[PDB]
Write a protein that binds this ligand. Structure first.
Ligand SMILES: O=C(O)CCC(=O)C(=O)O
Ligand SMILES: [Mn+2]
Length: 213
């Protein structure tokens, strides 16, 4: 069988991935406390309708900009519909990324927190190309996990038992997605890779021509 094709694809995906450990135990602890605060405030109904997206395995919290249901016709909510990026995100997360030249100042106009229960997951998807610019930066928080690329296995486990690549994502680590890894392949999380609670902050810039609702 041609498993050289799988090695070619994995190499192409590797080239769109950069990773650095940026946040110490203490820094992570402080951000985690704030994440916990977002969850509490969401339970209290303190956010706009489109800020919070509650689902069985995973909750998402949209700040700055957000979007609708996503076959692939995601739309951007009008200004004011989602809550603004909280100051602690600017101070504790974004600043540290700018200070380490991960992304430039003023790039980030969208912050999304994904909160996973054990056994939570993400189904195969590409980050909406018509909505977000690249690179796509994310920071992992409560525990360690794995990000998979080439997620055909979620649907055809007999034909292909495995992802093209699995990327470890440690607590306090920064993942940057671009090129092939962001545009040419899907990613996902396997339920089994989420043993304990895990949250992630995803920092992006929305496109200027992003279709609006
Ligand atoms: O949970 C992660 O590390 C990736 C998040 C993700 O794929 C998304 O919400 O778009
Ligand atoms: Mn994604």
């Amino acid at each position: 069988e041609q498993q050289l094709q799988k090695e070619e694809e994995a190499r192409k995906v590797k080239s769109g991935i950069r990773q650095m450990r940026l946040f110490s135990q203490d820094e992570c602890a402080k951000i985690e406390a704030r994440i916990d605060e977002v969850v509490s405030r969401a339970e209290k109904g303190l956010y706009n309708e489109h800020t919070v997206d509650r689902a069985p395995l995973r909750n998402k919290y949209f700040f700055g900009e957000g979007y609708t249901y996503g076959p692939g016709q995601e739309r951007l909510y009008p200004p004011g519909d989602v809550d603004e990026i909280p100051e602690w995100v600017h101070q504790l997360v974004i600043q540290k990324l700018v200070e380490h030249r991960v992304i430039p100042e003023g790039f980030v106009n969208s912050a999304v927190i994904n909160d996973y229960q054990p056994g939570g997951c993400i189904v195969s998807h590409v980050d909406p190309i018509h909505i977000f610019e690249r690179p796509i930066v994310s920071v992992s928080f409560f525990s360690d996990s794995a990000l998979c690329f080439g997620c055909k296995f979620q649907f055809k486990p007999i034909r292909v038992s495995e992802p093209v690549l699995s990327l470890p994502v440690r607590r306090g680590s920064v993942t940057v997605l671009s090129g092939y890894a962001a545009d040419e392949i899907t990613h996902c999380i396997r339920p089994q890779d989420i043993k304990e609670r895990r949250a992630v902050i995803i920092l992006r810039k929305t496109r200027l021509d992003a279709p609006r609702l």
